[PDB]
């Protein structure tokens, strides 16, 4: 079981951290959503699908900097919704496949009231995910760390 992102960017067998970098909707509303979909940017597989299924959760997502301080969130994984930060790991998804499969999540993030101007500066930190796979043969137990920063500035109109 290993990962690479979009910008190619691996975590090999074992776990790791990895940086990725996401362009984000310029001008959000407050009461509207923000859309961060890492689908698009995050894919693993498993390597042993012959005699090795892999479980993969996310298992803490905690928000940072201008998601932290102007948002309220959840995330889909898997097409379900859960609170944004996290509040306990999620299902897991099974992989069975050698072929890369996006890793299913979504932000979904809401400016609140009390935002207002440059509410995501960029370059910054909006998100760290924790992927956990474990599997159902051994005792590996490993975190794959996904830092989501931010291109752009996202303001939240006036
Ligand atoms: C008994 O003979 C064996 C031969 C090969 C293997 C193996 C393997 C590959 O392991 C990797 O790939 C597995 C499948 O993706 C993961 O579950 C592991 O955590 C790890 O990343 C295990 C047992």
Redesign the pocket.
């Known amino acids: 079981?290993?990962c690479k992102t979009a910008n190619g960017t691996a975590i090999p067998?074992?776990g790791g951290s990895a940086n990725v970098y996401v362009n984000l909707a310029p001008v959000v509303n407050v009461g509207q959503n923000l859309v961060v979909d890492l689908s698009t940017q995050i894919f693993c597989?498993?390597?042993?699908?012959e005699?090795?299924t892999?479980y993969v959760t996310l298992q803490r997502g905690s928000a940072y900097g201008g998601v932290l301080s102007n948002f309220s969130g959840t995330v889909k994984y898997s097409g379900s919704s859960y609170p944004f930060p996290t509040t306990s790991e999620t299902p897991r998804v099974v992989?069975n496949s050698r072929t890369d499969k996006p890793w299913p999540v979504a932000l979904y993030l809401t400016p609140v009231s009390s935002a207002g101007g440059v509410a995501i500066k960029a370059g910054s930190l909006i998100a760290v995910l924790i992927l956990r796979?474990t599997?159902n043969?051994?005792s590996?137990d490993?975190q794959f760390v996904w830092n989501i920063y931010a291109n752009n500035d996202v303001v939240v109109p006036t």
């Open positions: 079981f290993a067998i074992g597989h498993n390597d042993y699908p005699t090795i892999d992989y796979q599997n043969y051994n590996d490993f």
